[PDB]
Design an enzyme around this catalytic site. Sequence first.
Site, mmCIF file in Angstrom:
data_model
loop_
_atom_site.group_PDB
_atom_site.id
_atom_site.type_symbol
_atom_site.label_atom_id
_atom_site.label_comp_id
_atom_site.label_asym_id
_atom_site.label_seq_id
_atom_site.Cartn_x
_atom_site.Cartn_y
_atom_site.Cartn_z
ATOM 1 C CG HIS B 41 -0.543 0.458 2.474
ATOM 2 N ND1 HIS B 41 -0.384 -0.426 3.506
ATOM 3 C CD2 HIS B 41 -0.276 1.700 2.932
ATOM 4 C CE1 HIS B 41 -0.005 0.290 4.543
ATOM 5 N NE2 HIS B 41 0.092 1.564 4.239
ATOM 6 C CG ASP B 90 -0.365 -3.673 2.940
ATOM 7 O OD1 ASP B 90 0.211 -3.224 1.901
ATOM 8 O OD2 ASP B 90 -0.617 -2.975 3.938
ATOM 9 C CG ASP B 186 -2.797 0.797 16.973
ATOM 10 O OD1 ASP B 186 -2.190 -0.215 16.525
ATOM 11 O OD2 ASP B 186 -3.879 1.206 16.505
ATOM 12 N N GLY B 190 1.815 6.325 9.550
ATOM 13 C CA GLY B 190 3.186 6.601 9.118
ATOM 14 C C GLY B 190 4.219 5.518 9.411
ATOM 15 C CB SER B 192 2.373 2.100 6.519
ATOM 16 O OG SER B 192 1.041 2.270 6.970
ATOM 17 N N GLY B 193 4.511 -0.458 6.753
ATOM 18 C CA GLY B 193 5.662 -1.108 6.136
ATOM 19 C C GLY B 193 6.738 -1.534 7.112
#
Lengths: 55, 254
Positions: B41, B90, B186, B190, B192-193
């Site tokens: 994504h 993903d 959590d 930002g 992500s990945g």
Amino acid sequence: ICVNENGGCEQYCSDHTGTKRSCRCHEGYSLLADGVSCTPTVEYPCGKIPILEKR
Amino acid sequence: IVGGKVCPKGECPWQVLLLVNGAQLCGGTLINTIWVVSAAHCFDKIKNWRNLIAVLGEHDLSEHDGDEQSRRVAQVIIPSTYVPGTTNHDIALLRLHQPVVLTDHVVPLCLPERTFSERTLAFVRFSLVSGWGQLLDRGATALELMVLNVPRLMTQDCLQQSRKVGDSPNITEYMFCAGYSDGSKDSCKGDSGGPHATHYRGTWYLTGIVSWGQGCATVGHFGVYTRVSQYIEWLQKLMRSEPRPGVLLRAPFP
Ligand SMILES: CCOc1cc([C@@H](Nc2ccc3cnccc3c2)C(=O)NS(=O)(=O)c2cccc(S(N)(=O)=O)c2)ccc1OC(C)C
Ligand SMILES: [Ca+2]
């Protein structure tokens, strides 16, 4: 087994013909004579933190 | 990262910062000197494929201390089953133009074997998630790398422990939930990945990828992570293959 407590292996476990089991290690590691432990063969093996290992 | 702490410099040495035109894009994980695992994504809105940079040895975004190593991303490999704008599959596999040099600040995370990951790693309760993402939902991003310890839960338990929201995506076998439902801790948009790294007998392994969630640290919700064990063979086969012309490559999955 390999299903039960990772066949006693520190890293990878392979099941064999009967009650036979072979432990293996990720590249940059070697299996000790105990047949379960993995020792680094390189300066920067994967998944180890140098500043923590050096302390 | 919401409710975490600063990762002391050098304690997340596999953390990658992905940049596009110098701007923070996503996180990633170094798995050897030339390969990086991130989220598919992250690349949905990229048009300037030549402006894609991976930074290793990064810690503080306000200063250059000399341990940072940046490399052009030569290839972005995404499974054929991933559909842009959606959540399933993903994952992205990035080939760096030149290898990074391993140092005390740049070390790869172990990509485990599938069996070891499913039979052993899937049962380690807690794992670390990291990034320079949002410190709060609708908050500013972090200047120093943040780290958070999150527990993993089974999908039946994640679905029953979650607030039923309309049009919410399904949690597939290519995902897992990890985190807290109390709104305190959590990973965030930002991050992500980035890595979801699991410790087992003195070694750290890649088990997840920061993928999605409903807001950040939302009450009744958990972080959703790409279940990396499903892609081990897919990743290994690609790492043994010769580069192909073009930055973006779609590769058959399975
Ligand atoms: C597959 C990606 O799915 C989504 C990703 C995010 C977000 N990443 C997040 C968000 C919240 C999180 C909460 N806890 C832990 C981790 C988290 C990670 C993100 O990328 N936002 S974004 O705006 O940069 C973005 C970019 C590409 C694709 C999407 S999209 N089209 O899937 O919404 C969103 C939000 C919603 C998503 O969509 C589903 C349909 C709920
Ligand atoms: Ca810096």
